[PDB]
C-alpha cells in the first residue's frame, strides 16, 4: 500500500495521554480525537507531533459527530509556522477499538492528507501490545459481488524516538528502566513476550471462532480462508528430514558455544592468575 | 572409588578415582599415585573405556603399572587367550595388589570389546569366525555371547541362525542425532562451571 | 501460439505442428506466412530451433512440478526418443540451464537438488514468519468484524 | 558366564556342582536364565525356527515351548518361524526433545547471567 | 655497491619470471645489466 | 479431505476418484498446479503426488467448530511453553 | 610439518652438517608419502625436478615412491618392508618406524578401495601379493581403528566401501582435542587454588 | 621466441612461456617479420595449455593479430574451441582439418599428447556431469573410447580427486557423489583449540613461576 | 505516562520468535570463530610478553595496540548470545508451531 510502516514518537504518546486526561477531566469522554503531524520518508510514516481538535459524538447514533475542521486548519497554520516540515499525516483517537464512524471521520481527514493514517493510541496501559494501531483507508473489492466499501487496512506500527526525544525519555525512565540485564537475558524476555503475544493472538481467534460457532457473528469467509492457510502453514516437525536437519544445525551451534565457553573458562583462569599475583605482590610489600 | 568399584558402580568409581588423582600432591605421595593409577586402569577397562597411554610413561609408574600395561594390551585386542596369558603370569601380583577380583571381571569386558570390533569391521561375519577371533570354545557359545551383546546395546546387529552369520547394522550418521549435543552439553556446562 | 509459450503447462510438439504448423510454414492467402519458418535452409534451421524451444519449455515445466520423473516418461512427454531426450537434457544440465541428475541404470531423473540443512530450516523459518504474519493479519480482520457486528 | 552371556555353560554348571547342597539354588537361577535368553532372542534374532530354539532354550519336551510361548506372547508363524519384528520401537529419533533441549540451553543463559 | 646491486637485480629477474628461488641465470643476467649496460 | 501428514496422493487414487486414465493423472496435476488450485509436486517414479497446499474453501459451522478445537490444543501448547520458559528462566527474566 | 618444510628447501638445501643431500631427499620423499594428498604428491614430489634428479641415483627410493602412485601395490609392499628396516636403523625415524609403516599400509589400502565401490578379499590379496587372511586381519584392524572407510563381508569375502562425512571426523577430534584442552584447564585450576 | 620454446619444452609453467612468446610476437610484429605468425601460434598454444581457451579468440581479434588471420590462427582457434566445448571429437577433427598447421609443427606436436590427455579429463567430466549413476558402456559410447580405457581413466580421476565418485566393477556403473564442502567452522574451531591450548601452556609457566 | 514511554523500542512479539537466517547465522558463526583463530594466536603472545614487562607499561604499552584478550571476550560474548538465542528460539518454535 501507500504506507509500509508508521513510526509514532513518544511526544505523540504523551500528548495523546495528556489530551485524553484534560478533556476527560471536565467530562467523561468515550474518546478524544486529534490530528497527527509528521513527515514522509520513502514509504514509512514518521508521526512526530499532534494537536487536539474539538470533537464530540452521540453514542446512540454513529452518524451524529462533530469535528471542528476550522480549528483543524487554524492549528495547522500554527504548527506549520513553527515547523514547516511537519505536515498533516492523519488523525488519532483514544478509543480502545475502532468505531463505525471512523471511516466517516477519515474522509474529513482525507481532504487535508489524501493518504490519511488513523492511529489508535490506547491510553490504558496494555501489558503486552503497543498502544498504537495504525490503519489506512482502502477500497476492499469483494469477490462475492457485494459493492466495494471503504475499510481500514492495518499498518504495522513502531514507537521510535528522535535523538533529543530519546534523551528526555531516558531521563523520565531513568529510575524504572533496568539496563543491568544483559543482552542474552533481554532476548529471552523477548521470547517470553513473543510466546505471550502469540498466545493472546490465538485466544482472540479462538474467541472469534467460539462466537461464530454459537451464532453471535456470521461466517466472514475471509477469516476462514485465512485460517485454513494458517493451519496449513503449520510445519510437521516430526519429519525425518527436518529432525535430522534440526539435529545437524543444533550441533553446529553447540560446538561454537562449546568453543566460546572453552575460551571463556581459560580467560577466566587468566584473570584469577592476575588477581592472585596482584594479591601476593600487594601483601609482599606490606 | 574402591568401594564403588567392588559394588559394580564403575561409572561413579571412575569419577572419584580421577578426582583423587587431581587432588593428590603434585610432587610427593608417589605410592598413593601408583595405587590409584592401578585401580583407575582396571575401572577404566571395566567401564569399557581406554586407559591413557601417558600414565604408563612416567618414571615412577612405569615399573608399577607394567603388569597393568600388559593387561590393558590384552583387553584392547579383545582376545581371550591374550587376556588369560596375563592372568596366569601376573595373577600373584594382582592378588598382592588387592585388585585380582576386578581383573577377573575383565574377562566379560574382553568379550565385549572383541565383539565390538567384529561388528565395527565386518558387515556380515560367520559365527565360527567370531569364535576364532575371540578365541571362544565353539560357535554355539559365541551364538549366545553375540546375542547378549545385541540385547545389551553393545552392538547393533542381527543373527541368522539358519545361515550361521551375524549381520551388523548400517552405521547411522551420529551427527544427525542428539549425541553431539549431549556430549557438548556435558562439556559446555563444565566450562561454565570453571 | 505466444500464449502457449506463456502458459506454465506442457505443450506437445506434435500438437503444435497439426494446430499451427500450416499457419506458420505455408500460411494462408488471407494471412500470408512470414519467412521465419520458410522452406529455405534458414527457415528449416529456425523450425528445428522452434522444436528445441518447445522441448526446452517442457523440461522447464517438468522441473518446476516434478521432483522425480522417468526417462521413459520424459521421452514420451518431450516427443523425443530416450537417447535424444537424454542428450537434450544433458546439454541443458551442462550449460547450467536446468538442474537434473540422471540415474541411467534406474532411468530416473532427479530435479530436486541435494537439500542443505540450512535450506530445510530456512524454509521452516519462512513458514513460521508467514504463519505469524497471517495470525496477526487474521486478528485485524477479526477486529473489523467485531466493530461492524456489535 | 552369566554376565558374559555364556548361557550354555550356565546349564552345564548343574552337572559339575561341587556338592549336593548346591542343587537347590541352581533351579531358581535356571528359571531366570530361560527368560533372559529368550529376551536375547527377541532383540537379536529377527526370526528363528521352532525346534531351532530347542537347544537355545534348553527345553527337553517340545510341548514345553508351547506353554512358554504364550507366556512370552511369541507369534508362531506358518513355517514354524517365530517372527520377532519389534525393532520398529526405535529410540524414537522421530521426535525432537524440544522441552529438554530448551531447559538445557536456558541453563547456559543462567550460568552466564544469574552469576551476578 | 655494484656487487650488492647485482644481487638485488638478480632477485628482480626471478620476479620477472614469477619464480621464488633465484637461479644462477638470474645472477648472470644481473651481472650483464649492472656492469655492461650500466 | 486428507490431513497434512498424509497428503501424498498416489496416481491410482487420483485416477479412480476423477475417472481418468493413470497416464492422464499427470496432466491433471499440471493444470491444478499451473492455475494455482493446489500447490505441490509430482513424483512420477513412485507414482505419487505431494500436495502441500490447497485453495481455501467455504466451511460449515461444524468444520469451523473443529477448527476452533484445533486452536484449543494450539493455545495449550503455547501457554505450556510460556510457563516453561518463565519457570526455567525466572532468575534471568527481566 | 616435516613434509612442508622439507619441500620448501628441496631446492635450497645447504645444511650438509646435518645430512647429505641424497639422504635429505630420501627423507623428504618418505615424509611426503605419509603427509601429502595424491594431488599434492604429484605436483611436488612426482613432478618435482629437484627430487626426480636425485631419485636417478636412488632406485630403491624411486621404486618406493612411484609404486604407490602408479598403484603397484605388490611392489609398494616390498618397498615398504625395505623402508621399515632403513627407518629402524635411523635415529630420527626409529621411534616412528612402526607408526609410519602402519600409516603407509593404511594409505595403500585406502587408495586401492577409494575408487571402487566393492573389492573382493582375493583381489586385495592378489594386488598386494599377500594372502587373503593377511588382508582380512589388516583390514579388520584398521577398520576397527576407524582409519579405513570400508566394511568386510567375510561370508562372501567382499569389502564394501563407505563415505562418512568430514563432519563426523571433525566432531570426534573436537571431542578428542577439546578434551585434552579441558584437562589442562582443569589441572591448571588445581595448581592455582593450592 | 627461443626462450619460450625451451621453456615450453621443459614443461615448466606456461604463463612465463606465454610472456616470452608475447614479447617475441611484438618484436616480430613491429618489424613486419614472416615469423610473427609462428610466435602467434605458440601464444595461442600456451593459452590452451593454461586451461584458458577463451583467451585465444580475444587474442586473434586484436588489431595486431588481425593482420595475421589465416590458416595458422584458424588451426589454434578451432582447437581452443574444442577445449572450450570439452569435446575430444572436435580435437581429432581439428587435428585432421589442420594437420599440416598442427601435427607438422614440431613445437605443437610434442604438446599434443598432453593436450589429448587434458581434453580427455574435461570431456569425461562433461559426459558424467548430468549423471548420478551411469553405465561405463554409455560413457564409453559417448566418449568414443574403449570401456577399459574409460574405466582406468575414471579410477585415476577418482584417485586424483578430479571428481567425486566410485566405480562399481560388478555392474559397470560410475556413481557420482554430490559431496558437501568441509565445514570451515569446525576447521577454525580445531585450530582455535590448538592455538588456545598454547595459551594454557603459557598460563602454566606463569602460574608455577609466580606462585 | 511512564508506562507509555516504556513502549519505546519495545520489539514486536513476532521478532522474539523470529529465527535468524541460518545461512547468515552460520556465516557469522564461521567468520567470528575464524577471528578467534588469529586472536588466540595473538593471545598466546600477549601472555608471554606481559610476564617479562614492567608494571609501568602494563597499560601504556596497551595504548594503540589491540588487546587479544578483550576482543576474545567480545567475540565469545557475541557468539554465546547469538547461538543460545537461536537454539532456544528454534526449540520453542518446534512445539509452539506443530502440525499435530
Swiss-Prot record, chain A:
Cross-link for Glycyl lysine isopeptide (Lys-Gly) (interchain with G-Cter in ubiquitin), residue positions: 177
InterPro entries xref list: EIF3F/CSN6-like_C, JAMM/MPN+_dom, MPN, MPN_RPN7_8
Occurrences of domain MPN (ranges): 6-141
UniProt entry tagged with the keyword Ubl conjugation: yes
Positions bearing N6-acetyllysine: 201, 211
A Pfam family that the UniProt record links to this protein: JAB
GO cellular component, one term: nucleoplasm
Keyword Acetylation annotated: yes
SMART domains noted in UniProt: JAB_MPN
Entry GO MF terms: protein homodimerization activity
Gene Ontology biological process: proteasome-mediated ubiquitin-dependent protein catabolic process
Keywords from the UniProt entry: Acetylation, Isopeptide bond, Proteasome, Ubl conjugation
Family: Belongs to the peptidase M67A family.
Oligomer and partners: Component of the 19S proteasome regulatory particle complex. The 26S proteasome consists of a 20S core particle (CP) and two 19S regulatory subunits (RP). The regulatory particle is made of a lid composed of 9 subunits including PSMD7, a base containing 6 ATPases and few additional components. Within the complex, PSMD7 interacts with subunit PSMD4 through their respective MPN domain. Interacts with TRIM5.
Anything else known: Does not bind a metal ion.
PANTHER family (alphabetical): 26S PROTEASOME NON-ATPASE REGULATORY SUBUNIT 7, EUKARYOTIC TRANSLATION INITIATION FACTOR 3 SUBUNIT F-RELATED
This protein's name: 26S proteasome non-ATPase regulatory subunit 7
Organism annotation: Homo sapiens (Human)
Gene: PSMD7
Curated annotation (Swiss-Prot), chain C:
Modified residues (N6-acetyllysine): 64
Segments crossing the lipid bilayer: none
Listed GO CC annotations: cytoplasm; cytosol; extracellular exosome; extracellular region; ficolin-1-rich granule lumen; membrane; nucleoplasm; proteasome accessory complex
Subunit structure as annotated in this protein's UniProt entry: Component of the 19S proteasome regulatory particle complex. The 26S proteasome consists of a 20S core particle (CP) and two 19S regulatory subunits (RP). The regulatory particle is made of a lid composed of 9 subunits including PSMD12, a base containing 6 ATPases and few additional components. Interacts with ERCC6.
Function: Component of the 26S proteasome, a multiprotein complex involved in the ATP-dependent degradation of ubiquitinated proteins. This complex plays a key role in the maintenance of protein homeostasis by removing misfolded or damaged proteins, which could impair cellular functions, and by removing proteins whose functions are no longer required. Therefore, the proteasome participates in numerous cellular processes, including cell cycle progression, apoptosis, or DNA damage repair.
Family: Belongs to the proteasome subunit p55 family.
Name of the protein in its database record: 26S proteasome non-ATPase regulatory subunit 12
Organism: Homo sapiens
UniProtKB/Swiss-Prot annotation, chain D:
Covalent cross-link (Glycyl lysine isopeptide (Lys-Gly) (interchain with G-Cter in SUMO2)), residues: 63
S-S bonds: none
Family as reported in the entry's similarity comment: Belongs to the proteasome subunit S14 family.
Function statement: Component of the 26S proteasome, a multiprotein complex involved in the ATP-dependent degradation of ubiquitinated proteins. This complex plays a key role in the maintenance of protein homeostasis by removing misfolded or damaged proteins, which could impair cellular functions, and by removing proteins whose functions are no longer required. Therefore, the proteasome participates in numerous cellular processes, including cell cycle progression, apoptosis, or DNA damage repair.
Subunit note: Component of the 19S proteasome regulatory particle complex. The 26S proteasome consists of a 20S core particle (CP) and two 19S regulatory subunits (RP). The regulatory particle is made of a lid composed of 9 subunits including PSMD8, a base containing 6 ATPases and few additional components. Interacts with DDI2. Interacts with TASOR.
Name the UniProt record assigns to this protein: 26S proteasome non-ATPase regulatory subunit 8
Gene name linked to the record: PSMD8
Curated annotation (Swiss-Prot), chain H:
Keywords: Acetylation, Cytoplasm, Isopeptide bond, Nucleus, Phosphoprotein, Proteasome, Ubl conjugation
Tissue expression remark: Highly expressed in embryonic stem cells (ESCs). Expression decreases as ESCs differentiate.
Record-annotated PCI domain positions: 13-181
Biological processes per GO annotation: proteasome assembly; proteasome-mediated ubiquitin-dependent protein catabolic process; stem cell differentiation; ubiquitin-dependent protein catabolic process
Effect upon mutating residue 61 to A: Does not affect phosphorylation by AMPK
GO cellular component: cytosol; extracellular region; ficolin-1-rich granule lumen; membrane; nucleoplasm; nucleus; proteasome accessory complex; proteasome complex
Family under the similarity heading: Belongs to the proteasome subunit S9 family.
Role this protein plays: Component of the 26S proteasome, a multiprotein complex involved in the ATP-dependent degradation of ubiquitinated proteins. This complex plays a key role in the maintenance of protein homeostasis by removing misfolded or damaged proteins, which could impair cellular functions, and by removing proteins whose functions are no longer required. Therefore, the proteasome participates in numerous cellular processes, including cell cycle progression, apoptosis, or DNA damage repair. In the complex, PSMD11 is required for proteasome assembly.
Protein's name according to its UniProt entry: 26S proteasome non-ATPase regulatory subunit 11
Gene name, Swiss-Prot/TrEMBL: PSMD11
Amino acid at each position: 500500500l501507500a504506507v509500509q510502516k508508521v513510526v509514532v514518537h513518544p511526544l505523540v504518546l504523551l500528548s495523546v495521554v495528556d489530551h485524553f486526561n484534560r478533556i476527560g477531566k471536565v467530562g467523561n469522554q468515550k474518546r478524544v480525537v486529534g490530528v497527527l503531524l509528521g513527515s514522509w520518508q520513502k514509504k514509512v510514516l514518521d508521526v512526530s507531533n499532534s494537536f487536539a481538535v474539538p470533537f464530540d459524538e452521540d453514542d446512540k447514533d454513529d452518524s451524529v459527530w462533530f469535528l471542528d475542521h476550522d480549528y483543524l486548519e487554524n492549528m495547522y497554520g500554527m504548527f506549520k509556522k513553527v515547523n514547516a516540515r511537519e505536515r498533516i499525516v492523519g488523525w488519532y483517537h483514544t478509543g480502545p477499538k475502532l468505531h463505525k464512524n471512523d471511516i466517516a471521520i477519515n474522509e474529513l481527514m482525507k481532504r487535508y492528507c489524501p493518504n490519511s493514517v488513523l492511529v489508535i493510541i490506547d491510553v490504558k496501559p496494555k501489558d503486552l501490545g503497543l498502544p498504537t494501531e495504525a490503519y489506512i483507508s482502502v477500497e476492499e473489492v469483494h469477490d462475492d459481488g457485494t459493492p466495494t466499501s471503504k475499510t481500514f487496512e492495518h499498518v504495522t506500527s513502531e514507537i521510535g524516538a528522535e535523538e533529543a526525544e530519546e534523551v528526555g525519555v531516558e531521563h523520565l525512565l531513568r529510575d524504572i528502566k533496568d539496563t543491568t540485564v544483559g543482552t542474552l537475558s533481554q532476548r529471552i524476555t523477548n521470547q517470553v513476550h513473543g510466546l505471550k503475544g502469540l498466545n493472546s493472538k490465538l485466544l482472540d481467534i479462538r474467541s472469534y471462532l467460539e462466537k461464530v460457532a454459537t451464532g453471535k457473528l456470521p461466517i466472514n469467509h475471509q477469516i476462514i480462508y485465512q485460517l485454513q492457510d494458517v493451519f496449513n502453514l503449520l510445519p510437521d516437525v516430526s519429519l525425518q528430514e527436518f529432525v535430522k536437519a534440526f539435529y545437524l544445525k543444533t550441533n553446529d551451534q553447540m560446538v561454537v558455544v562449546y568453543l566460546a565457553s572453552l575460551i571463556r573458562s581459560v580467560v577466566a583462569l587468566h584473570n584469577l592468575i592476575n588477581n592472585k599475583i596482584a594479591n601476593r605482590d600487594a601483601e609482599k610489600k606490606e | 572409588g574402591r568401594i564403588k568399584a567392588i559394588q559394580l558402580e564403575y561409572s561413579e568409581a571412575r569419577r572419584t578415582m580421577t578426582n583423587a588423582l587431581r587432588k593428590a600432591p603434585q610432587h610427593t605421595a608417589v605410592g598413593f599415585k601408583q595405587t590409584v593409577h592401578k585401580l583407575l586402569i582396571v575401572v577404566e577397562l571395566l567401564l569399557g573405556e581406554i586407559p591413557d597411554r601417558l600414565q604408563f610413561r612416567q618414571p615412577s609408574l612405569k615399573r608399577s603399572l607394567m603388569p597393568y600395561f600388559l593387561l590393558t594390551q590384552a583387553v584392547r585386542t579383545g582376545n581371550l587367550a591374550k587376556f588369560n596369558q596375563v592372568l596366569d603370569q601376573f595373577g600373584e601380583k594382582f592378588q598382592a595388589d588387592g585388585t585380582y577380583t576386578l581383573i577377573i571381571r575383565l574377562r566379560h569386558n574382553v568379550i565385549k570389546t572383541g565383539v565390538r570390533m567384529i561388528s565395527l569391521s565386518y558387515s556380515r561375519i560367520s559365527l565360527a569366525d567370531i569364535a576364532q577371533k575371540l578365541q571362544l570354545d565353539s560357535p554355539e557359545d559365541a551364538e549366545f555371547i553375540v546375542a547378549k551383546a545385541i540385547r545389551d546395546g553393545v552392538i547393533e546387529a542381527s543373527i541368522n541362525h539358519e545361515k550361521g552369520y551375524v549381520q551388523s547394522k548400517e552405521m547411522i550418521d551420529i551427527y544427525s542425532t542428539r549425541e553431539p549435543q549431549l556430549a557438548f552439553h556435558q562439556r559446555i556446562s563444565f566450562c561454565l562451571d570453571i | 501460439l505466444l500464449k502457449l509459450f506463456t502458459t506454465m503447462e506442457l505443450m506437445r510438439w506434435s500438437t503444435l505442428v497439426e494446430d499451427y504448423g500450416m499457419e506458420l510454414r505455408k500460411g494462408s492467402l488471407e494471412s500470408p506466412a512470414t519467412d521465419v519458418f520458410g522452406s529455405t535452409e534458414e527457415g528449416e534451421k529456425r523450425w528445428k530451433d522452434l522444436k528445441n524451444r518447445v522441448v526446452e519449455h517442457n523440461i522447464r515445466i517438468m522441473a518446476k512440478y516434478y521432483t522425480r520423473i522417468t526417462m521413459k516418461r520424459m521421452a514420451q512427454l518431450l516427443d523425443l526418443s530416450v537417447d535424444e531426450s537424454e542428450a537434450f537434457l544433458s546439454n541443458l544440465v551442462v550449460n547450467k540451464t536446468i538442474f537434473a541428475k540422471v540415474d541411467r541404470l534406474a532411468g530416473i531423473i532427479n530435479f530436486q537438488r541435494p537439500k542443505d540443512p540450512n535450506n530445510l530450516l530456512n524454509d521452516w523459518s519462512q513458514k513460521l514468519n508467514s504463519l505469524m504474519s497471517l495470525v496477526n493479519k487474521t486478528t485485524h480482520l477479526i477486529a473489523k468484524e467485531e466493530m461492524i457486528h456489535n | 558366564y552369566l554376565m558374559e552371556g555364556s548361557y550354555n555353560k550356565v546349564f552345564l554348571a548343574k552337572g559339575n556342582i561341587p556338592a549336593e547342597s548346591y542343587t537347590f539354588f541352581i533351579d531358581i537361577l535356571l528359571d531366570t536364565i530361560r527368560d533372559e535368553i529368550a529376551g536375547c532372542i527377541e532383540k537379536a534374532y529377527e526370526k528363528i525356527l521352532f525346534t531351532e530354539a530347542t537347544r537355545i532354550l534348553f527345553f527337553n519336551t517340545p510341548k514345553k515351548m508351547t506353554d512358554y510361548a504364550k507366556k512370552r506372547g511369541w507369534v508362531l508363524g506358518p513355517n514354524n518361524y517365530y517372527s520377532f519384528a519389534s525393532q520398529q520401537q526405535k529410540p524414537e529419533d522421530t521426535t525432537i526433545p524440544s522441552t529438554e533441549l530448551a531447559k538445557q540451553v536456558i541453563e547456559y543463559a543462567r550460568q552466564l547471567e544469574m552469576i551476578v | 655497491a655494484e656487487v650488492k646491486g647485482v644481487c638485488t637485480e638478480a632477485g628482480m629477474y626471478a620476479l620477472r619470471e614469477r619464480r621464488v628461488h633465484v637461479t644462477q641465470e638470474d645472477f648472470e643476467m644481473a651481472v650483464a645489466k649492472v656492469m655492461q649496460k650500466d | 479431505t486428507r490431513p497434512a501428514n498424509h497428503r501424498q496422493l498416489t496416481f491410482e487414487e487420483i485416477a479412480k476418484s476423477a475417472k481418468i486414465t493413470v497416464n492422464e493423472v499427470e496432466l491433471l496435476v499440471m493444470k491444478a498446479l499451473s492455475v494455482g488450485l493446489v500447490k505441490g509436486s509430482i513424483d512420477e517414479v513412485d507414482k505419487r503426488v505431494h500436495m502441500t497446499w490447497v485453495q481455501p474453501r467455504v466451511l460449515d459451522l461444524q468444520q469451523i467448530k473443529g477448527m476452533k478445537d484445533r486452536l484449543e490444543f494450539w493455545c495449550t501448547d503455547v501457554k505450556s511453553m510460556e510457563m516453561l520458559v518463565e519457570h526455567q528462566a525466572h532468575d534471568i527474566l527481566t | 610439518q616435516a613434509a612442508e618444510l622439507f619441500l620448501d628447501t628441496v631446492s635450497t638445501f645447504t645444511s650438509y652438517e646435518l645430512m647429505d643431500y641424497k639422504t635429505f631427499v630420501t627423507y623428504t620423499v618418505y615424509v611426503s608419502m605419509i603427509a601429502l594428498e595424491r594431488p599434492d604428491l604429484r605436483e611436488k614430489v612426482i613432478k618435482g625436478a629437484e627430487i626426480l634428479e636425485v631419485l636417478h641415483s636412488l632406485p630403491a627410493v624411486r621404486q618406493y615412491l612411484f609404486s604407490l602412485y602408479e598403484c603397484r601395490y605388490s611392489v609398494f609392499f616390498q618397498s615398504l618392508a625395505v623402508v621399515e628396516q632403513e627407518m629402524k636403523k635411523d635415529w630420527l625415524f626409529a621411534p616412528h618406524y612402526r607408526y609410519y609403516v602402519r600409516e603407509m599400509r593404511i594409505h595403500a589400502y585406502s587408495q586401492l578401495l577409494e575408487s571402487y565401490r566393492s573389492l573382493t578379499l582375493g583381489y586385495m590379496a592378489e594386488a598386494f601379493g599377500v594372502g587373503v587372511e593377511f588382508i582380512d586381519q589388516e583390514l579388520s584392524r584398521f577398520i576397527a581403528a576407524g582409519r579405513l572407510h570400508c566394511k568386510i563381508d567375510k561370508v562372501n569375502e567382499i569389502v564394501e566401501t563407505n563415505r562418512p562425512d568430514s563432519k563426523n571426523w571433525q566432531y570426534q577430534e573436537t571431542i578428542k582435542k577439546g578434551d585434552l584442552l579441558l584437562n589442562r584447564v582443569q589441572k591448571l585450576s588445581r595448581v592455582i587454588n593450592m | 621466441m627461443q626462450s619460450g620454446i625451451i621453456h615450453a619444452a621443459e614443461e615448466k609453467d606456461w604463463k612465463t612461456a606465454y610472456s616470452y612468446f608475447y614479447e617475441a610476437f611484438e618484436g616480430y610484429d613491429s618489424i613486419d617479420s614472416p615469423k610473427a605468425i609462428t610466435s602467434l601460434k605458440y601464444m595461442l598454444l600456451c593459452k590452451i595449455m593454461l586451461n584458458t581457451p577463451e583467451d585465444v579468440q580475444a587474442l586473434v581479434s586484436g588489431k595486431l593479430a588481425l593482420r595475421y588471420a589465416g590458416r595458422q590462427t584458424e588451426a589454434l582457434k578451432c582447437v581452443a574451441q574444442a577445449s572450450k566445448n570439452r569435446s575430444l571429437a572436435d580435437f581429432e577433427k581439428a587435428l585432421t582439418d589442420y594437420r599440416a598447421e598442427l601435427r607438422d609443427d614440431p613445437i605443437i606436436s610434442t604438446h599434443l599428447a598432453k593436450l589429448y590427455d587434458n581434453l580427455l579429463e574435461q570431456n569425461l567430466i562433461r559426459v558424467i556431469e548430468p549423471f548420478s549413476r551411469v553405465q561405463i558402456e554409455h560413457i564409453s559410447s559417448l566418449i568414443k573410447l574403449s570401456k577399459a580405457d574409460v574405466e582406468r581413466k575414471l579410477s585415476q580421476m577418482i584417485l586424483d580427486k578430479k571428481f567425486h565418485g566410485i566405480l562399481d566393477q560388478g555392474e559397470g556403473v560410475l556413481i557420482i557423489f554430490d559431496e558437501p564442502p568441509v565445514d570451515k567452522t569446525y576447521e577454525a574451531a580445531l585450530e582455535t583449540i590448538q592455538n588456545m591450548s598454547k595459551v594454557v601452556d603459557s598460563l602454566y609457566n606463569k602460574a608455577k613461576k609466580l606462585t | 505516562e511512564q508506562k507509555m514511554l516504556l513502549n519505546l523500542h519495545k520489539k514486536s512479539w513476532m521478532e522474539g520468535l523470529t529465527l535468524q537466517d541460518y545461512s547468515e547465522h552460520c556465516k557469522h558463526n564461521e567468520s567470528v570463530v575464524k577471528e578467534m583463530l588469529e586472536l588466540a594466536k595473538n593471545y598466546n603472545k600477549a601472555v608471554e610478553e606481559e610476564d617479562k614487562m614492567t608494571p609501568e607499561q602494563l597499560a601504556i604499552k596497551n595504548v594503540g595496540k589491540q588487546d587479544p584478550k578483550r576482543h576474545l571476550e567480545e567475540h565469545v560474548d557475541v557468539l554465546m548470545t547469538s547461538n543460545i538465542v537461536q537454539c532456544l528460539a528454534a526449540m520453542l518454535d518446534t512445539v509452539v508451531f506443530k502440525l499435530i
